[PDB]
Design a protein around this ligand. Structure first.
Ligand SMILES: *[C@@H]1O[C@H](CO[C@@H]2O[C@@H](C)[C@@H](O)[C@@H](O)[C@@H]2O)[C@@H](O[C@@H]2O[C@H](CO)[C@@H](O[C@@H]3O[C@H](CO)[C@@H](O)[C@H](O)[C@@H]3O)[C@H](O)[C@H]2NC(C)=O)[C@H](O)[C@H]1NC(C)=O
Ligand SMILES: *[C@@H]1O[C@H](CO)[C@@H](O[C@@H]2O[C@H](CO)[C@@H](O[C@@H]3O[C@H](CO)[C@@H](O)[C@H](O)[C@@H]3O)[C@H](O)[C@H]2NC(C)=O)[C@H](O)[C@H]1NC(C)=O
Ligand SMILES: *[C@@H]1O[C@H](CO)[C@@H](O[C@@H]2O[C@H](CO)[C@@H](O[C@@H]3O[C@H](CO)[C@@H](O)[C@H](O)[C@@H]3O)[C@H](O)[C@H]2NC(C)=O)[C@H](O)[C@H]1NC(C)=O
Ligand SMILES: *[C@@H]1O[C@H](CO)[C@@H](O[C@@H]2O[C@H](CO)[C@@H](O[C@@H]3O[C@H](CO)[C@@H](O)[C@H](O)[C@@H]3O)[C@H](O)[C@H]2NC(C)=O)[C@H](O)[C@H]1NC(C)=O
Ligand SMILES: *[C@@H]1O[C@H](CO)[C@@H](O[C@@H]2O[C@H](CO)[C@@H](O)[C@H](O)[C@H]2NC(C)=O)[C@H](O)[C@H]1NC(C)=O
Ligand SMILES: *[C@@H]1O[C@H](CO)[C@@H](O[C@@H]2O[C@H](CO)[C@@H](O)[C@H](O)[C@H]2NC(C)=O)[C@H](O)[C@H]1NC(C)=O
Ligand SMILES: *[C@@H]1O[C@H](CO)[C@@H](O[C@@H]2O[C@H](CO)[C@@H](O)[C@H](O)[C@H]2NC(C)=O)[C@H](O)[C@H]1NC(C)=O
Ligand SMILES: *[C@@H]1O[C@H](CO)[C@@H](O)[C@H](O)[C@H]1NC(C)=O
Ligand SMILES: *[C@@H]1O[C@H](CO)[C@@H](O)[C@H](O)[C@H]1NC(C)=O
Ligand SMILES: *[C@@H]1O[C@H](CO)[C@@H](O)[C@H](O)[C@H]1NC(C)=O
Ligand SMILES: *[C@H]1O[C@H](CO)[C@@H](O)[C@H](O)[C@@H]1O
Ligand SMILES: *[C@H]1O[C@H](CO)[C@@H](O)[C@H](O)[C@@H]1O
Ligand SMILES: *[C@H]1O[C@H](CO)[C@@H](O)[C@H](O)[C@@H]1O
Ligand SMILES: *[C@H]1O[C@H](CO)[C@@H](O)[C@H](O)[C@@H]1O
Ligand SMILES: *[C@H]1O[C@H](CO)[C@@H](O)[C@H](O)[C@@H]1O
Ligand SMILES: *[C@H]1O[C@H](CO)[C@@H](O)[C@H](O)[C@@H]1O
Ligand SMILES: [Ca+2]
Ligand SMILES: [Ca+2]
Ligand SMILES: [Ca+2]
Ligand SMILES: [Ca+2]
Ligand SMILES: [Ca+2]
Ligand SMILES: [Ca+2]
Ligand SMILES: [Ca+2]
Ligand SMILES: [Ca+2]
Ligand SMILES: [Ca+2]
Ligand SMILES: [Ca+2]
Ligand SMILES: [Ca+2]
Ligand SMILES: [Ca+2]
Ligand SMILES: [Ca+2]
Ligand SMILES: [Ca+2]
Ligand SMILES: [Ca+2]
Ligand SMILES: [Ca+2]
Ligand SMILES: [Ca+2]
Ligand SMILES: [Ca+2]
Ligand SMILES: [Ca+2]
Ligand SMILES: [Ca+2]
Ligand SMILES: [Ca+2]
Lengths: 554, 559
């Protein structure tokens, strides 16, 4: 059938000047002579929003009542009827579309009053940072809804490092590089415009953007101290040598900023310890060992600075680790007298051919440690158990009082020890102790003698144990060599040697007669030496009844 | 079916921005996937005026091409079609009316540059004088065509005595009464306006109307204040006596203004005739009968004045006829001698016993008409055929010259007529004639005599007719009495009276022989008189030849 021409009406205006906007009518009223009542139905009449359209039952004319708004109603598809007096259709109901024409009656508005994004420092060009957005409620795919995003102002404005795509709202990084040390945070006011995106004096909606620039370790540390010299006193420990103040441009607090240290050379002795003070970013070096001013050790050392986190690839190999030298000066302190060595060893001999009672054999001179010169003092002897030595009270010269005896009970590991003290003149009177190590030469002045030359065994005895004693130390005692001699003749076969050891021997009589024998030995040193005295063993073999010692009278 | 809502377009305007003004379409194209072509027909496309609308065969859109003028085309009733490729209908053709909206783009204009109308004087209020008209070609029954008639300027502007209905254009009279004697014609300029009848500085078309106030006789005539005496002469006729001048306020020339006259008293004799002069409005009185100064010296009379037309009902019962005095005196004229009567009667007799030859028997005295006295004149006889009279030239005395005879052939009806003339002395000779009628007494002096005493009849005749003659007038002639007398004896018995007429008689003789006879009569008068002479009839009976005359010889004198 025929399509009824649709009606066009503009939004947001009074349309009373266009009424009636439409009129339906049947030719069955005049030609066929029937009273027909017209009525419409549809959105705006029988459906919401109500009270938009009204109609005359008799004429069939249409009427606009209110102002249309296409943002709420894009079109009205209402239908007209022609009814008889009863209420039935005399004509097939027609559809009449009413199109509402768009007008640009609402501005683009941002989804947020404030946008926030972040981008890393030294980012490549055209790196997407973030994206802003807005919406326009007007007719889609028309200039009334085409948004154009623009940058109003910027901080710190110059230079420009952000490009705002006006069509997409995307923000990119430009070809100018970002440097956080130049500008950490960018705050930016944007704008959204309607139509053709033409900048006019019209006040349009605007939001703000806040971009935070992230940090990278692209700045090498630098020492700020003018004078770099350490300072410690003598005989001190756990003291502050120096504080190495270092500057770093990167983000304060971060591992990209935190100073970090390593000894290059000079601390092989382990005299220093270094650690970074994270609050002042100072390298704290301290003494972990006492130093003697007089020994005059050079404690100078060198150190290398870097960041706790590695350097950015952007700056690597542009960095050469150059060791930073640090001289350290030491303070002298009045210490008073001392000995050039706490212990001294003087070597003496047991023989008279070199050692003699009353010969000088050394001194224990006390020096003033500060000036290193000999100081006037009063020396005194100490703990001389067997009175081997004499100490002069003034000159400190030491001389023997006896001939040393290596075999003495007071000698241990071949040494005879003696303490001595020295006292200074004037105040404050200081007392220092010394030690002398008297190493006595062991000479072979002892020969192997029997400890039990006379003894008496049982008849059931299995063997006899002969044992010797040479008080001499190695090698002047060592293993003995035993030798039983044939005196009287035949006896050498009567008394055999079964087993021998280093200082003893086992002896077995073959025939096993019961009586006393005089058995001479020649027991010789490891050097071959032997006693002038004859080593004789008087052994009496007795008849032992079990339990008892020896038989009686019978 | 559904009637398509018509589309409206304003005339006298460019409609390009409104195109396409309309569009038809079928849903059979989209649903059925068929190629359809649309087309329109009607006034503006296929009928004149042409090329006003054009249409797109494919879309079905309509367009207007030129500027419209609804005064030429009020609307366009065209019809749309939907056709397939073959050329047949896929939809019922719909009617699509295109209405043209009016604009007030032409002004009201009068049917004529000038109107003329008429209204009678002192007409009642709201009397329709006339009607003016104007036309507006714009849409009927709209303010664009509602005309408003108004009076621009009137002369005399004041007072307002005309009301012009702005809606109808009709002109009426107001309660202020019109007086044509004050103002005869109103010339009047009117105007016609468009819209709601609002008077603006806009130049609108204007016309002029001319109104004539027609006259009515509502003003009574008035005569001058002088006495109007007149004077005519004696023996004059058809002469102007006087001119009665009369004034009248009504329309000059009209019968409401024309003086009119009726005689009140003094013209019973029919001596005067009056007729009004239409140019001067004067009453022209003229003498239509001669007057005698000796008999009448004054001819005074009266007339009353009115109008030729009747007075208007408004002014009637206010008019009171006042007779106008007209003294007119007659002037004497020398008329000279005259007779106190043109005719005289004189009685005379035929007998000598009273009338005598030479006796005075009357006079014909001439009098001087002016003085009434007897005047000296010379009198003379006239037409006296038989000389019966002598008239004295000096004294006018009349006397016989002969004895009058009643039987005279010159006498007629017993009267004898004779004229007389009198001539005056001094200059000029006036001559007057008189008449004297002389009546004569008839006396019995004639006797009945026979006219033919000698006769000759035939023997075939059975009677003979004898006749007498008495020349006297009645009664002295009258009937006769005849008597045949016995002389000689015997005659009386043979000649017998058969029958007698008044003046004659016939006789029959018994014997009737052939010969002459002597028959004596005594014929007596009606008075008894008879002739002194013997009255004898000599009758000769002759043979006759049964035809006529006497047959034989001597009875003829000669032949
Ligand atoms: C034959 O005789 C020697 C000599 O000793 C005598 O007889 C022994 C049985 C012991 O009673 C001795 O006290 C006595 O002098 C035997 O002695 C051996 O040597 C010494 C003691 O003589 C022992 O040496 C050791 O010393 C270390 C520290 O220096 C200790 O920790 C040990 O406890 C021990 O004292 C050694 O033990 C001892 N030998 C033994 C007991 O077998 C010797 O052994 C005996 N036989 C032979 C074949 O000569
Ligand atoms: C529907 O809308 C139509 C169009 O606006 C309205 O119809 C028209 O209404 C006006 C206003 O009453 C009428 O004109 C008026 O005339 C009066 C006096 O005649 C005058 O005082 C006003 O200033 C105005 O000029 C007009 O005749 C009428 N019809 C048409 C065809 O225009 C109507 O009021 C609306 N309502 C309904 C119920 O349809
Ligand atoms: C920029 O703003 C736009 C517009 O707001 C965001 O786009 C989003 O578009 C979605 C479509 O997915 C819309 O929400 C959706 O509605 C449809 C039907 O109307 C529904 O089917 C989906 O389930 C969803 O609800 C919406 O218009 C819109 N979102 C908002 C919050 O408005 C876009 O995400 C924004 N950009 C950024 C970076 O936030
Ligand atoms: C404007 O219309 C008027 C009135 O309708 C016409 O003029 C007047 O018309 C009347 C009616 O005819 C005239 O009266 C008489 O008309 C009859 C027709 O039956 C005619 O036979 C008579 O002789 C007489 O004319 C009237 O006189 C006439 N006059 C005037 C001054 O209007 C006319 O159509 C238009 N205007 C004019 C001014 O004519
Ligand atoms: C019918 O009316 C339309 C206007 O609605 C005319 O169309 C335009 O004509 C002008 C001049 O040629 C141009 O703008 C375009 O060619 C047409 N369309 C548009 C959208 O502008 C059309 O000319 C009219 N009459 C015809 C076609 O005969
Ligand atoms: C003036 O008007 C009078 C009255 O209208 C006229 O009078 C009549 O004249 C006729 C004709 O002879 C007589 O029969 C009537 O008797 C008259 N009537 C009256 C009332 O007098 C008169 O003729 C007019 N006179 C003139 C000269 O115009
Ligand atoms: C005698 O003759 C005369 C004339 O010839 C006649 O007289 C007649 O008288 C009558 C009166 O009765 C008159 O009319 C005339 O005088 C005569 N007759 C006429 C005119 O016809 C008459 O005929 C004779 N008389 C008689 C017969 O008695
Ligand atoms: C920083 O300290 C690290 C351990 O945290 C240690 O290896 C060195 O002293 C410094 N730097 C590097 C790279 O090792
Ligand atoms: C000194 O002697 C004892 C016994 O001879 C021995 O065990 C010790 O090892 C020696 N001292 C040292 C340091 O060896
Ligand atoms: C005579 O008088 C008579 C009678 O009236 C008349 O008939 C006749 O005409 C008159 N004739 C003459 C001449 O007088
Ligand atoms: C150290 O030795 C003695 C005691 O140990 C003191 O008396 C002396 O003066 C020195 O200070
Ligand atoms: C060394 O020796 C004695 C102890 O034997 C100390 O008391 C003295 O002061 C010195 O330091
Ligand atoms: C020798 O040894 C003593 C302790 O036995 C020390 O105190 C002294 O200083 C010396 O070195
Ligand atoms: C009238 O009559 C005669 C004519 O007969 C005139 O001549 C005479 O003069 C008188 O006037
Ligand atoms: C009367 O008679 C004669 C003629 O009859 C006139 O001519 C004369 O004037 C007189 O008046
Ligand atoms: C007598 O008769 C004559 C005519 O017969 C008149 O004219 C004359 O005036 C007189 O009256
Ligand atoms: Ca809107
Ligand atoms: Ca909108
Ligand atoms: Ca918009
Ligand atoms: Ca940087
Ligand atoms: Ca950085
Ligand atoms: Ca760093
Ligand atoms: Ca020191
Ligand atoms: Ca020191
Ligand atoms: Ca020894
Ligand atoms: Ca020794
Ligand atoms: Ca030894
Ligand atoms: Ca026009
Ligand atoms: Ca018009
Ligand atoms: Ca008047
Ligand atoms: Ca008048
Ligand atoms: Ca008059
Ligand atoms: Ca006279
Ligand atoms: Ca006179
Ligand atoms: Ca006579
Ligand atoms: Ca006589
Ligand atoms: Ca007689």
């Amino acid at each position: 059938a025929w399509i009824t021409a649709p009606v066009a009406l503009r939004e947001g205006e009074d349309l009373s000047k266009k009424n009636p906007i439409a009129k339906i009518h049947s030719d069955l009223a005049e030609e066929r002579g029937l009273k027909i009542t017209y009525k419409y139905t549809g959105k705006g009449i029988t459906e919401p929003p109500f009270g938009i359209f009204v109609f005359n039952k008799d004429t069939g004319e249409l009427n606009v009542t209110s102002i249309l708004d296409r943002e709420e109603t894009p079109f009205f598809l209402l239908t007209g009827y022609a009814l008889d007096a009863r209420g039935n259709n005399v004509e097939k109901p027609l559809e009449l579309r009413i199109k509402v024409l768009d007008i640009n009656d609402n501005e683009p508005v941002f989804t947020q009053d404030v946008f926030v994004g972040s981008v890393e420092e030294l980012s490549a060009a055209h790196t997407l940072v973030m994206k802003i957005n807005a919406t326009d409620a007007d007719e889609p795919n028309t200039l009334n809804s085409k948004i154009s995003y623009r940058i109003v102002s910027l901080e710190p404005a110059y230079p420009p490092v952000f490009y705002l795509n006006k069509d997409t709202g995307e923000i990119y990084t430009t070809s100018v590089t970002l440097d956080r040390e130049e500008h950490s945070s960018y705050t930016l006011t944007v704008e959204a415009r309607d139509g053709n995106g033409e900048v006019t004096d019209k006040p349009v909606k605007q939001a703000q953007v806040q971009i935070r620039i992230l940090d990278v370790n692209d700045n090498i540390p630098v020492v700020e101290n003018k004078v770099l010299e350490g300072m410690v006193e003598e005989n001190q420990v756990n003291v502050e040598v120096t504080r190495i103040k270092v500057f770093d441009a990167d983000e304060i607090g971060s591992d990209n900023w935190l100073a970090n240290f390593t000894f290059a050379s000079g601390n092989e002795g382990g005299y220093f310890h270094i650690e970074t003070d994270a609050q002042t970013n100072e390298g704290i070096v301290t003494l972990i060992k006492e130093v003697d001013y007089e020994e005059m050790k050079n404690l100078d050392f060198s150190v290398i600075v870097a960041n706790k986190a590695a350097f950015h690839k952007s700056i690597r190999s542009k960095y050469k680790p150059t060791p930073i030298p640090i001289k350290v000066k030491v303070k002298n302190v009045k210490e008073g007298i001392h000995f050039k060595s706490s212990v001294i060893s003087i070597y003496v001999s047991e023989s008279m051919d070199r050692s003699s009672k009353g010969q000088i054999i050394g001194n224990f001179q006390a020096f003033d440690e500060d000036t290193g010169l000999p100081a006037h003092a009063r020396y005194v002897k100490l703990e001389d158990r067997d009175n081997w030595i004499s100490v002069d009270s003034v000159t400190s010269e030491i001389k023997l009082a006896k001939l040393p005896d290596f075999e003495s009970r007071y000698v241990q590991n071949g040494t005879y020890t003696v303490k001595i003290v020295a006292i200074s003149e004037d105040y404050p009177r200081k007392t220092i102790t010394g030690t002398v190590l008297i190493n006595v030469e062991d000479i072979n002045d002892n020969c192997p003698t029997l400890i039990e030359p006379v003894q008496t065994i049982c008849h059931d005895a299995e063997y006899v144990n002969v044992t010797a004693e040479d008080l001499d130390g190695h090698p002047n005692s060592g293993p003995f060599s035993f030798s039983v001699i044939d005196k009287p003749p035949g006896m050498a076969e009567k008394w055999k040697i079964a087993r021998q050891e280093s200082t003893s021997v086992l002896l077995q009589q073959s025939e096993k007669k019961l009586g006393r024998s005089e058995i001479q030995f020649l027991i010789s040193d490891n050097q071959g030496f032997s006693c002038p005295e004859k080593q004789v063993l008087t052994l009496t073999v007795c008849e032992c009844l079990h339990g008892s010692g020896c038989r009686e009278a019978h």
